């Protein structure tokens with residue numbers, strides 16, 4: 001028998017045996033997130049450890065097939081996925097200690113709470129304690145306290161654990177034929193085998209930096225506009241030429257500037273587009289929100305939601321009789337079982353989120369015919385980009401007026417559109433320098449370019465230069481501010497949020513052309529476009545079988561990520577910001593600090 | 597006498613697809629009104645003959661094949677299919693003359709803890725001939741080294757269980773299939 005034919009039969013055994021164990025592990029974790037009890041938390045771990053022990057057994061079993069002896073490109077991808085040694089390349093004690101520090105970091109991040117020196121009986125953790133302060137408070141000292149206390153209390157504890165976290169993760173990647181742990185994460189975008197569609201792990205660094213240079217002009221003008229508005233909110237605290245203090249950006253880390261809309265709104269007199277009260281008066285329930293979202297995907301050519309979706313999803317809060325995690329998630333348990341976990345409330349923010357999570361389900365339904373190891377997005381950024389383009393179309397005034405949530409006589413002035421684009425830019429383009437700088441810092445740390453004695457020194461040098469954000473109080477090497485973020489201390493790659501952002505606008509521009517849209521890109525709604533739905537479905541069905549460069553080409557017509565569609569979305573705002581900043585200073589000095 | 601169609605359709609226990617059973621129908625008058633005037637079936641697809649003109653027709657004898665497959669596997673119980681069920685479990689001839697009837701049995705054939713009784717053959721040397729039946733549980737040798745009766749590397753057990761559960765999608769729920777074959781005693 002040919003090694004290629006022996007591997008195909010082996011994958012047939014795996015795809016049938018793994019699909020059954022994966023469903024038991026997924027349903028076990030579903031019964032926990034919808035019903036937090038001790039009996040269900042052990043069933044989640046038992047079915048989870050059984051799936052982990054099964055996956056490890058098939059890992060070494062798949063390694064006995066030489067990957068070089070396979071000519072079929074599809075089966076070669078499946079073997080390479082199983083042949084990854086992963087974390088088992090360490091010794092029994094190093095792998096046990098690695099999982100010990102990974103759990104300790106995740107624990108102290110979620111359980112760490114700081115107390116007020118003015119009132120020691122008032123102690124708040126990150127959520128919802130400190131997050132409510134960073135998002136609503138206008139007191140400089142109150143925000144400075146919550147910002148510094150989170151990085152001096154739970155941040156200093158993560159410093160020794162993150163040091164051992166780096167050395168152990170490097171010992172894993174170097175043993176699996178990788179340069180470092182950062183090179184391991186960049187392997188998700190690696191394509192090697194298809195002529196004209198390859199992509200190296202180092203090519204990601206070149207492309208992310210090349211596209212980021214074109215985002216600088218748009219971000220610098222947004223930074224200058226936000227800084228001018230922030231000076232009116234915090235007089236005698238911000239320099240008109242210096243960087244923005246970190247504790248005044250809207251959240252704990254400055255990742256999103258969404259909370260600055262109340263302080264940076266261009267035209268506050270104009271009516272807000274909040275259709276929350278409209279559906280309540282029109283007698284809408286949580287069932288109607290998902291029924292209306294289902295009608296949206298059917299209008300573009302995508303199929304309905306399965307019967308098991310309406311029978312097994314938890315679309316409402318069970319209340320005090322059954323505690324459940326209310327994080328909106330889209331579950332793909334396999335074997336035709338698609339569910340959505342969301343404590344939906346009759347609001348506009350949940351209406352748009354319902355389109356995002358159901359967009360994930362339409363992606364899962366598409367590649368269901370692919371083999372088990374191929375049922376996933378093209379890369380880590382493709383899945384989140386599909387869900388975001390749905391909320392873009394569902395949030396347009398043309399769609400809200402057509403459904404009946406906005407009044408038919410709502411005038412769309414040129415100032416209402418600038419208000420909307422400014423709100424989008426505070427969330428979309430405001431996180432791009434933060435995302436790139438964060439992953440750039442971890443790439444350098446993993447690569448070995450930042451020694452331990454200058455981790456925080458180089459962290460804030462890049463914050464000043466790249467993001468344009470200065471720390472309010474000086475931090476030595478005792479702190480570990482990057483670890484104070486969830487994705488860093490919980491072992492998650494962060495470059496996915498940069499690539500997904502450029503993908504979602506390449507998808508939107510590609511779909512709006514197929515949707516025959518003619519106005520500005522931000523006013524586009526792909527509703528009723530069976531051509532755009534067919535054009536999008538042609539890439540959703542690929543899953544991970546074809547390389548992401550080919551899957552991206554099937555929709556946008558390009559083999560690589562492009563920043564041009566992102567600039568066209570915020571083009572009316574970019575010219576407006578340049579007019580506003582004609583008497584302002586565009587740019588920042590990397591030397592000013594609120595404590596020099 | 598009436599032909600006992602209730603003994604196969606309304607049968608309590610249904611066999612696995614790999615070990616499907618066949619029942620011969622000899623001297624009796626048929627009554628296809630029960631099978632034709634009912635919305636209980638999920639497919640009911642006839643080949644070579646029509647679902648209505650069969651009432652005024654006669655055959656030498658009728659053969660009823662019964663088994664259980666998943667929802668997505670019902671499409672393979674048709675002439676000219678090449679799936680796993682058609683190749684290794686139950687194959688219909690190209691010149692097949694009959695009707696294939698299937699209906700969902702999630703409430704009786706799928707349990708919460710997982711019904712692993714219904715199985716199917718996943719590995720086999722070559723495809724099955726039309727109407728062939730294979731119940732051998734011999735260790736399938738996928739590699740060149742011998743198995744020696746102990747399944748191991750490149751040596752897999754030929755049978756795998758469906759594992760039906762009521763929360764599966766419609767494409768993965770259990771469906772009972774009854775294939776009526778016509779051979780040229782039985783009239784309408």
Ligand SMILES: *[C@@H]1O[C@H](CO)[C@@H](O[C@@H]2O[C@H](CO)[C@@H](O[C@@H]3O[C@H](CO)[C@@H](O)[C@H](O)[C@@H]3O)[C@H](O)[C@H]2NC(C)=O)[C@H](O)[C@H]1NC(C)=O
Pocket residue numbers: 008071072073074075678
């Ligand atoms: C790599 O291997 C896979 C399978 O191991 C190859 O895909 C297979 O391609 C054949 C030829 O088209 C497919 O057979 C067809 O099946 C349909 C099913 O209805 C039938 O109607 C056709 O008449 C034909 O027999 C087969 O299904 C398909 N298998 C899978 C899993 O997709 C693939 O072509 C190989 N790639 C290379 C580059 O060799």
Ligand SMILES: *[C@@H]1O[C@H](CO)[C@@H](O[C@@H]2O[C@H](CO)[C@@H](O[C@@H]3O[C@H](CO)[C@@H](O)[C@H](O)[C@@H]3O)[C@H](O)[C@H]2NC(C)=O)[C@H](O)[C@H]1NC(C)=O
Pocket residue numbers: 299401402403527528
């Ligand atoms: C294209 O998309 C639009 C909006 O998603 C679909 O049009 C909508 O169709 C419904 C019923 O077919 C209309 O409801 C009716 O509206 C009229 C006028 O307001 C009202 O008098 C009736 O009592 C009823 O409520 C809805 O207004 C209409 N919206 C728009 C903007 O035309 C349309 O079906 C889609 N085209 C397709 C799928 O081919």
Ligand SMILES: *[C@@H]1O[C@H](CO)[C@@H](O)[C@H](O)[C@H]1NC(C)=O
Pocket residue numbers: 031035037038039040
């Ligand atoms: C919640 O868990 C309890 C026991 O832990 C169980 O009796 C009950 O059926 C569960 N409810 C749901 C909806 O899973």
Ligand SMILES: *[C@@H]1O[C@H](CO)[C@@H](O)[C@H](O)[C@H]1NC(C)=O
Pocket residue numbers: 063083084085089175176177
């Ligand atoms: C996984 O580790 C084993 C240790 O013996 C090694 O033989 C094997 O080559 C490793 N796999 C890969 C893909 O490097």
Ligand SMILES: *[C@@H]1O[C@H](CO)[C@@H](O)[C@H](O)[C@H]1NC(C)=O
Pocket residue numbers: 298303304
């Ligand atoms: C989707 O379901 C609705 C009823 O909920 C039905 O009217 C419509 O025809 C269905 N569409 C498809 C494509 O199945």
Ligand SMILES: *[C@@H]1O[C@H](CO)[C@@H](O)[C@H](O)[C@H]1NC(C)=O
Pocket residue numbers: 414415418
């Ligand atoms: C909108 O247009 C009016 C006239 O068409 C103009 O006076 C006003 O300045 C414009 N506003 C913006 C923000 O461009």
Ligand SMILES: *[C@@H]1O[C@H](CO)[C@@H](O)[C@H](O)[C@H]1NC(C)=O
Pocket residue numbers: 601602603605606630
């Ligand atoms: C099975 O029982 C039902 C009872 O309602 C009956 O209507 C049907 O005719 C029976 N099936 C056959 C093949 O006789």
Ligand SMILES: [Cl-]
Pocket residue numbers: 246253481482
């Ligand atoms: Cl920070």
Ligand code: NA
Pocket residue numbers: 135136137259260261262263
């Ligand atoms: Na605010």
Ligand SMILES: [Zn+2]
Pocket residue numbers: 356357360383384387
């Ligand atoms: Zn999402």
